[PDB]
Design a protein around this ligand. Structure first.
Ligand SMILES: N[C@@H](Cc1c[nH]c[nH+]1)C(=O)O
Ligand SMILES: N[C@@H](Cc1c[nH]c[nH+]1)C(=O)O
Ligand SMILES: Cc1nc(N)ccc1Br
Ligand SMILES: Cc1nc(N)ccc1Br
Lengths: 414, 414
């Protein structure tokens, strides 16, 4: 035999598993359309340039890359956001803004699974927190559409500006801010002592760290205000954020967590994460504001951006745990059963009529006995079995039977 | 700047181009559902083993492949059919047959464009030509659904068994039959003299070639019969085929062409190609019967298979040529315009109501003047603009205006 298992770390999607994936993707699509985003795509294979940010990131560290025969540096994309930036940047003044773009790219890592699908939603050209508000509400919407509630999940929200103020006041050149987020992002996962030591390696001093941990463990926006001011950008922003989410009707879904930073270098302002309220699973989704990526890529004018990624794995685990992923059995409207081979030409004409009317229909393709054909109809989840027999055809009729046996005229079938 | 162009031979799909791709994919999906096929997927990255057939094929020759860091032979799939076989074979006795599986994989080649999307439709477990009939009718259906007619296109049909009989009677061991098809497949593309010389290289003699070209240029099924018999498999098959397609209502779409072989090694019986009736474009789609692939992959019992691939490029060129690809402008049902920032909380509640009712709606995310907001609504193709102003909100109303301005109650919006 040839190897029937897929390549290391990659999933097969036979029809059963594919119905589960469609169930999910359908929601990502429907949500995106509900929120007015526009679909886009770009190649899974990008130039390796695009992902060299040098902030010790997990996503750049764990990169599926290789060299073409021509000697060019390429890589299977680990995330979408850089591809988006390339596209947006490719369009100059010609891109109407604001722009709301979404996609469901397969993304790759080398190491544990090595690929996944990630819904991406991004808003371009909106300075205000109204964008983050929309994005966060989109993630909730999607989760709600999958049957989840604010009892089951929520979205932790923060701003990196708070910590930016604190880092800056510590005398630390602003270049250090990206690696500091990537290290502090590991605060939950790994112990307190082993995070400290990373910051010491990147040249930071002890009193400047104290203020980091303290601010990380601040429990409220009012507590942040005490430390930084009530008309600091972040406080006004976050109050506006929570006020807007409150008004849209999703206030029970969102909450402030000062420990939330995310592990990506490019986030400048608000950042967020979906999580289950039982503490069982990793982040359901993740995003934030990244107002300087496109300047970094060489845009002559800075372009404000915000968005998120919502993976295809954790959501499923969670939906299984909550018994919200029932087997989706296959369905087709009609199965057309010729009484025998002499009725095939006639069964085809029937098949053609049914399909013309927008119905999904099979016709039995092999030579088989009526009861075996009917069993088959049940097995593939036919709503209806349509028997084409010679005695009924002579009368201009067929025999129909609902699975979930009467004589019926041809016109009246549809 | 970073490089804004995609990697060599790969396409970007910004929203405009993506709407064109959805237009097409929608039809592939809808057709598949109409014909009762089940979606599946597998990884774009496969083991290179899977494609070593050694019949001098163009698809194996032009393979996008590389080695992982672990030293394993892998490759971006050039086609789907081998992946399908792996899947089908992975399921043993447990796969209910017949099975009808479809997918729209991106496929890859190294060399001219290096990737494309290819609708795949395959039927597994059906001995009879009813499968090829269904497949061919599916391809037509799809093309018809894109606005094309039998005046514009058709599907040339043949059987490799005819040539098999002729090759065998020439004393040529059956091993030679796969390379002979791959060479003769180049009969249209390259000149008569340069095809002859390929067959001479693979050890064939002169009189055996004469019979090949003559049979290739036979113009009718009746002419084939003269040469091989009226109850040769192929003649009975093809008559059954054309009779069945005739009965389904698509007889004007299909026709016999003895020169049709396809360039793939695995086809055993009936084979077909879509083409434009003006002689301008390459093959729109291509397929056939491959009853021994799964035996070749190590199946303990032979499993009959048939199917086709339908690329995303030629169809588009053709649809453009026939003016059947109009710009699909963006649409959204509602754009919600707060009179000003003090009306935002209220505009959100409105936004929430609209979306709850299944409508697609935006809300203006930046701070902007009403007329600029309304311009924007037009630019993104809003069907309707919904103005949330303080005088109307106090009355429990909004101002609605159709783009393709009245006071309206909130309940009555939906
Ligand atoms: N690229 C981010 C998600 C994101 C989309 N837009 C902004 N952020 C991630 O992989 O987590
Ligand atoms: N794999 C074939 C198409 C096909 C699908 N099933 C059978 N044949 C191609 O690339 O042309
Ligand atoms: C979980 C994950 N994250 C990435 N960034 C890329 C692939 C995979 Br799998
Ligand atoms: C036209 C084409 N054919 C393949 N087999 C693979 C990629 C591409 Br592009």
């Amino acid at each position: 035999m040839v190897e029937t298992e897929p390549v290391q770390g990659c999933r097969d999607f036979p029809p059963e598993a594919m119905r589960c994936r469609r169930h999910l993707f359908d929601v990502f699509h429907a949500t995106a359309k509900t929120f007015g985003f526009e679909e886009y795509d770009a190649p899974v294979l990008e130039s390796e340039e695009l992902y060299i940010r040098k902030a010790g990131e997990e996503i750049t560290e764990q990169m599926f890359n290789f060299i073409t025969k021509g000697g060019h540096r390429v890589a299977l994309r680990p995330e979408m956001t850089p591809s988006l930036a390339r596209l947006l940047l490719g369009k100059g003044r010609s891109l109407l803004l604001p722009a709301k773009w979404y996609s469901i790219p397969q993304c790759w890592r080398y190491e544990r699974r090595r690929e996944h699908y990630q819904w991406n939603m991004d808003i371009v050209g909106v300075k205000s927190v109204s964008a983050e508000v929309e994005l966060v509400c989109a993630a909730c919407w999607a989760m709600r559409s999958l049957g989840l509630s604010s009892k089951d999940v929520g979205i932790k929200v923060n701003s990196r500006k708070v910590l930016q103020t604190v880092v800056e006041q510590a005398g630390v050149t602003s270049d250090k801010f990206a690696p500091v987020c990537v290290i502090v992002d590991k605060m939950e996962k790994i112990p307190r002592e082993e995070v400290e030591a990373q910051l010491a390696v990147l040249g930071l001093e002890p009193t400047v760290v104290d203020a980091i941990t303290t601010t990380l463990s601040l429990k409220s926006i009012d507590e942040i205000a005490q430390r930084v001011g009530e008309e600091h950008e972040a406080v006004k922003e976050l109050r506006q954020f929570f006020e807007q989410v409150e008004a849209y009707g999703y206030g029970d879904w969102v909450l402030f967590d000062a420990s939330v930073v995310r592990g990506l270098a490019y986030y400048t302002g608000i950042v967020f994460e979906g999580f289950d309220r039982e503490g069982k699973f990793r982040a359901l989704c993740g995003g934030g504001r990244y107002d300087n990526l496109l300047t970094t890529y060489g845009s002559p004018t800075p372009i404000p951006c915000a968005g998120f990624g919502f993976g295809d794995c954790v959501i499923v685990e969670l939906l299984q745990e909550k018994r919200l992923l029932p087997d989706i059995p296959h369905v087709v409207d009609d199965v057309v059963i010729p009484f025998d081979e002499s009725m095939r030409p006639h069964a085809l004409a029937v098949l053609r009529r049914l399909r013309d009317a927008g119905r999904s229909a099979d016709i039995i393709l092999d030579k088989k006995k009526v009861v075996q054909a009917f069993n088959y109809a049940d097995r593939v989840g036919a709503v209806r079995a349509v028997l084409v027999a010679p005695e009924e055809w002579e009368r201009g009729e067929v025999q129909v039977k609902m699975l979930r046996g009467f004589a019926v005229p041809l016109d009246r079938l549809v």
